[PDB]
Ligand binder design. Sequence first.
Ligand SMILES: Nc1ncnc2c1ncn2[C@@H]1O[C@H](COP(=O)(O)OP(=O)(O)OP(=O)(O)O)[C@@H](O)[C@H]1O
Ligand SMILES: Nc1ncnc2c1ncn2[C@@H]1O[C@H](COP(=O)(O)OP(=O)(O)OP(=O)(O)O)[C@@H](O)[C@H]1O
Ligand SMILES: Nc1ncnc2c1ncn2[C@@H]1O[C@H](COP(=O)(O)OP(=O)(O)O)[C@@H](O)[C@H]1O
Lengths: 508, 73, 160, 466, 157
Amino acid sequence: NSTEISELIKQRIAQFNVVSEAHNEGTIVSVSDGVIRIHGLADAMQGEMISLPGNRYAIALNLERDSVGAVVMGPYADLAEGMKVKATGRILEVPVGRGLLGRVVNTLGAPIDGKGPLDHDGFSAVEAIAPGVIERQSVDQPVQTGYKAVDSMIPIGRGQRELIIGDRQTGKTALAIDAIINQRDSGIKAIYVAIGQKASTISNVVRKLEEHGALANTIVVVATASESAALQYLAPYAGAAMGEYFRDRGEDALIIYDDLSKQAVAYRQISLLLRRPPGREAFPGDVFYLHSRLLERAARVNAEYVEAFTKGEVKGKTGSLTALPIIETQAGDVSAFVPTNVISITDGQIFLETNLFNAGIRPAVNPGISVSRVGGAAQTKIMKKLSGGIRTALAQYRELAAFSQFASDLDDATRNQLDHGQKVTELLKQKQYAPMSVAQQSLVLFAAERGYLADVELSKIGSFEAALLAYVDRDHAPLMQEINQTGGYNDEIEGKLKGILDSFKATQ
Amino acid sequence: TGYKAVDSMIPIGRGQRELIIGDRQTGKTALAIDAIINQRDSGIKAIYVAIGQKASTISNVVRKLEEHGALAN
Amino acid sequence: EFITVARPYAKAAFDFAVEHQSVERWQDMLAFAAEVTKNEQMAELLSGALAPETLAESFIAVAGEQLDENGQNLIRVMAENGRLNALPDVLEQFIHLRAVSEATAEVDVISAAALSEQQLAKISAAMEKRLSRKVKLNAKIDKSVMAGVIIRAGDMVIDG
Amino acid sequence: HHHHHGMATGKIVQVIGAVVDVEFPQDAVPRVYDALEVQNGNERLVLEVQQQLGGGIVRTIAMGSSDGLRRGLDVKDLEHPIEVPVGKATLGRIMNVLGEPVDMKGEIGEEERWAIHRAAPSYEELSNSQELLETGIKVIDLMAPFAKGGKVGLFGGAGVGKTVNMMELIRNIAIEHSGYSVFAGVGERTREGNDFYHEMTDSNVIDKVSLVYGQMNEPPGNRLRVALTGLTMAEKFRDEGRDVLLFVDNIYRYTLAGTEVSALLGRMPSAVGYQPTLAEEMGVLQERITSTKTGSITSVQAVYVPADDLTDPSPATTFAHLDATVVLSRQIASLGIYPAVDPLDSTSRQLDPLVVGQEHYDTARGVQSILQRYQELKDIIAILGMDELSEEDKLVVARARKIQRFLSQPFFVAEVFTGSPGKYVSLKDTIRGFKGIMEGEYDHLPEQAFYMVGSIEEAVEKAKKL
Amino acid sequence: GLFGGAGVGKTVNMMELIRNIAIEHSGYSVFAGVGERTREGNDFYHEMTDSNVIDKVSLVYGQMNEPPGNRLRVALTGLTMAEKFRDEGRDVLLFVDNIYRYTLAGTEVSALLGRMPSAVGYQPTLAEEMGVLQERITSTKTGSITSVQAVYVPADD
Ligand SMILES: Nc1ncnc2c1ncn2[C@@H]1O[C@H](COP(=O)(O)OP(=O)(O)OP(=O)(O)O)[C@@H](O)[C@H]1O
Ligand SMILES: Nc1ncnc2c1ncn2[C@@H]1O[C@H](COP(=O)(O)OP(=O)(O)OP(=O)(O)O)[C@@H](O)[C@H]1O
Ligand SMILES: Nc1ncnc2c1ncn2[C@@H]1O[C@H](COP(=O)(O)OP(=O)(O)O)[C@@H](O)[C@H]1O
């Protein structure tokens, strides 16, 4: 058993008499794949980083009686067992500075780009407690959908729990990913999680960072196949440290997170290593313990944030922090305990339907397949105002489906509904890659406001008529600035619309 | 009987395993337990299955034997 | 009777025994110990108690002080091991241990086992064989070799 | 090579099957893979490394046969934990997993040696390029674009033709070369193998490449080892050539051996009795794949899909690590369709409409729509039959069976299976097909005709007779 | 329990309750909440603002962050004072936060225990806990033990 020394038994043979020597560094008896049974460094600090041969430091969570062992991200094979330990006094900390927006880095913050520049301050541990209740300020801060049904379907205030949920190979790395673009010139600071990703994704991604040349407003770290899970296990927690430098900087941010589960069972592989009993699918009982830790992080502070780090050079003001969940489903199985505990956990929900994807419809998501408790607080008196019919049309088009089956059962009242629903259906369209004007949002109101449906009746002519429409904007586009600027609903302004309907008569 | 349509629907004699399966909330805990009253004459003594459910059940139940009368049997 | 477990214990033994050169002495210690272990009324008591100190003390206590300091700290190992219950097995091992160095013994051929210390297989062995002159004793031999040859024989009868 | 003198030994500690339980000096120490010799009665054998166990006793591995061994046996060791000769001379003759020349030719090969461990390029190190390839593939070349250097995925268990569909892979692969590339196969069948050898002879192409080929019945230890054979194999070339192409076999077996040994290691399996690090092993293997600025490489890959359980976490690591891939329909197969791929399934990340222009993206989209539809009503029919068929729908359905039926065409090399030959195909001609079909241009067109058929001109000749 | 849903403004209902506690009676009543969405508290603060329910304001802490054991454990805490006022015989009411969020709780308990996962890791005390609750609340000879519903439900049917 653990004793096993026998040779040190010779040592201990009489040395059971005398020991009383506490090294900072004990020999590491034997290893498997980075994790080693080990003895020494008599003093213990739970979850203490521990320096190694080479720079590496490691850590073990389990207080293990009479001996303990641990693993570290890195080359595990170089090492040789029973080496005098290298004690590391510090629990792990991560560098904290606000200047990285244009550059990305290894888990160490080691720029994988190899920018060579280093703009960061100090170093700080990855995980930490969240803010007190009521320290949070509720925040109405809207956000820019770019999928009309994204905002129209759902409003966005700063800080909320995102969902993405949808099948593997559904597009949802670029259905997932394609989302990230609408951010663009937003100006809020952000990062995107990467779980284990294939590099080419990274590269082409960078190219896209030519596509949106911007690329420097915000940075994101990465995970790759070589990566040590420990890297992952902290990797969400890792980013936690940083975005805390924005909210903690008083700034407001969102950080993408996706593909956790990969990390998760990886943490199971830890448990196997832990030789510790997991739950179903080898799932750690932790689960929502972890998800508790990381997931627990996001907030929009209140003027409690008036208490700041500097608390305060005031700046008595409230910070807010949002982020992006992405979920994935094999066969679309809701039973996923991950989606279960998680599902329970999520504040608002997003499902992508391989039907419309299978329809090849530009969107794959289903109305009511995705819902968010946050609701329309973010929706603007105009935006909030004009947006109602969606559900019914949803219902309607959905409900419309009902009689489609019984062929030819219905009259024109129905046909006017159904037609209208086909029409709205059409009205939904989106590019694979497009920016959103959101003055363009105003556009939709016409179909509501403007009859607009009878007009451009032809499928082709409806569709094209969208483009033609968009063009006609150039003819007159003064107020849009004000519009874009105003962000408010003026009855008087509605005149400008009514007259615009003429430009519809004008534009075909 | 205790239940007309069951009496008619099924006969009963002593020693024979009887089965019952039914929805909670109705009448389940209630069930026909009132058919204990069906005993009336009570030629054969019996004991109610007791399960840990409710002191209240215990209570209105006590009250119920009362209402019927009598539990000393 | 894990007894394989003996080695790390058992091994350090010979080494300490080597190093300590006690094996006369250590051998004594072992004799003494197995004796102590044997004690059955004691044995009932022996698994009785949780506190290891209590046993190191009490065991060591009634012991008659054949103990050694290396064997005190070390006995403390076996108790700290808690595995100590089965210890006597090691003596057997220790025997082989002691035996291992330079020893030899014998298997009775058909009669009784000389256990002669003869380190040359089939030679020092042969030396014993010739050394009979012990050729006298029957001790079931004839029934054995006649019955065993007879056994190969009926074996061939079967083969026949 | 150099002695490798003395070194004494571990004695064989315990007989656990092929698992090597044996014990060496205190100083005696390996790497997590390191070079050990031992002569069986017959021959020197070697057991690859142990992870880490104490007492000079650690475990170890073998490509050899365990039986007939005596315990406590002394065991030798070689300095070079792994040494893999790296030649360019190799293209002549195949070799053992040991690299022992598998052809009858003895080969001096080359002194440069390699080892299993290999590593990936820097973030900036590789090159990324859009160059693509198009061929007689009726759809997939059409249905999907193929960039240069791209690793094509094979879907499925075998029986799918995975060897014979794989044989198509040979064909098109065989069809176009315009370069130097090499592929091999392992844990695989000989009739194929020796055939590819005889036909390789006949081909006489072997100069261009040689490949050690592993055998199905082979011992696991080798099987495990074979990947390192792959990586090292590339390493010379990638250095040597900037460019390469290949193909990959039975990676199901890869998983299979790997899991198989896991608990043998005294480990608890990953789920479905998978092996706990199996993914780590995968990120290892796919990670082994690379194409660099200095050089890029292409190959296409196959693991037996176990049983068409898509949930297969094996299949997960597939799509996950997947680069390119294809799928096959045992209904479509079952449809008796010779080509038999899951078209609706397969997809090209590279496919871009902008890249593809609109006509491609568009048209493809349209067919996709049709599929959606025929799938879509397929229910309604099955229920109701067709009796109620909405006119328009009914029409589409015609176009449907027709279009499915339409995809199929002959292949020149294909005459083996079916005596019928076939031909290479021209993309533009396809583009035409897109329209006319989109048109349904030939209204009288025969359905039976369309299947396994030639061009609209050819099918027009059929159409004449047929 | 109250079958209920979001957007209902059920808080309005709750307020009416308290107002009937001091109005209809002497409520001497407090609300329980745990593991919940941060928002309502501010609203509650707002509401505790809006209300005089600040009189009388006990704030049951409501966060989920705690150890699942810590979280789950809150009951007896919730109990002991109503035990005071109902034990004061005084009419006493208290609001209950989560029902099958507490189900999730008791499970997370048994699992955390390393006590063998029951069927689907079923929680051991579901009867002992559930009926421990039962054991808590009755019209008691001293005073009735009156408490508000908790609605949290595993899928909320
Ligand atoms: N408006 C759109 N309509 C249809 N497809 C689109 C649209 N925008 C983007 N896509 C497509 O999503 C496709 C594939 O996305 P991706 O590569 O992420 O699949 P994936 O997400 O990796 O698989 P998974 O869905 O499992 O993550 C891209 O080819 C992209 O064109
Ligand atoms: N279909 C019915 N016809 C007549 N009376 C009914 C019917 N359903 C319910 N009842 C009334 O309800 C009572 C049975 O309710 P009770 O709660 O015992 O059902 P239950 O299933 O036992 O509930 P639980 O099992 O959940 O305690 C009977 O006294 C009867 O008065
Ligand atoms: N295009 C095709 N038409 C007809 N048969 C095919 C085609 N492709 C593969 N096959 C069939 O697949 C069968 C199985 O051969 P093999 O490739 O070993 O299947 P697998 O490798 O999937 O086990 C072969 O008999 C061959 O006829």
